[PDB]
Amino acid sequence: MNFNVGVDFPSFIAWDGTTSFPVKIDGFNQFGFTFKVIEELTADVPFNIFYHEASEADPCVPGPAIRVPDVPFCDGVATADGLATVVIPEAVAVDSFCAGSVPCFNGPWISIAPVTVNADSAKVQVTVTMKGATR
Amino acid sequence: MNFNVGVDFPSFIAWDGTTSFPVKIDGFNQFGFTFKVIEELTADVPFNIFYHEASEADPCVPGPAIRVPDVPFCDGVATADGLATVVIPEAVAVDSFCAGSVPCFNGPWISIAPVTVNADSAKVQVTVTMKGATR
Amino acid sequence: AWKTAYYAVEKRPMFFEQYEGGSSAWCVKYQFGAEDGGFVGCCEHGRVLRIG
Amino acid sequence: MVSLDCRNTCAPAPASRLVQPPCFVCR
């Protein structure tokens, strides 16, 4: 039993280590990130989450990047500046992966890009997986 | 209501456009490929599918590349060479994706690469999605 | 402490069927098969000894 | 804020951490 899982749960690159690709999520009703490390890290690497709105010139092209806001849960406290962020700990081994997702949608496009671009940033890869088709 | 889809259906990069990355399918019981274009194509691009055995000197590392053999279905015929291959046609638009997978597992690692490396191959991206885990 | 370190699962018992494509009035052909599986459970419930 | 879920490794122990046994007690 092997399935064509790509039909129902497609995945798209979001950060290949040198460039960031906006990923459209309008046609799907869930999504989540997946982080992988290809080499041992030397320090913590934080990531920033953005989102885009449809461009005025063309409704099929994204606009400038906006920053996702924070949404506190019933336990815990809000972020210092109230904006979502992701931090990959130094303990991550080359042979393991991490996964996390945002509680809310906001715009129809999403993206992720590191706070700083350096030799330690190229040692990571990020991918986005959709889970449901509404069309 | 969002979900952490990255926990149940992790996705991994396979062909970012300039390099091929082995993907370990050992820990999961299904998988599949997803092809996406980022710029217009000029001619059909064929892809080769491989699999790797465990390396002799270290089980942590994949071995050499081996082609995946074909498995004919009930009412059908085998390929001319007997091996598995995938072809991305010309009509694919930049806003669409294609998904397909092999019927059998073979080795524990998997890989994919274009038959020839040129200006056309760099315009395609490949990602691997995997179903529930087993450990 | 087996019964928690490893599990064994069976799906159906062996079945035998006669094949109409190879059978004649002078011959017979039988087909058979079965299904089963197994998966490790807890990794902390066992140990292994080796020479060193 | 996001809570990252991670798994130990792709392999249970890609290089299994075999360990010597406790040394013999005494004479």
TrEMBL record, chains A, B:
It comes from the Viruses. This is Structural protein. It comes from Agrobacterium phage 7-7-1. The lineage of its organism: Viruses, Duplodnaviria, Heunggongvirae, Uroviricota, Caudoviricetes.
From TrEMBL, chain C:
Transmembrane segments: none annotated. It is found in: Virion. It comes from the Viruses. This is Major capsid protein. It comes from Agrobacterium phage 7-7-1.
TrEMBL record, chain D:
It comes from the Viruses. This is Structural protein. It comes from Agrobacterium phage 7-7-1.
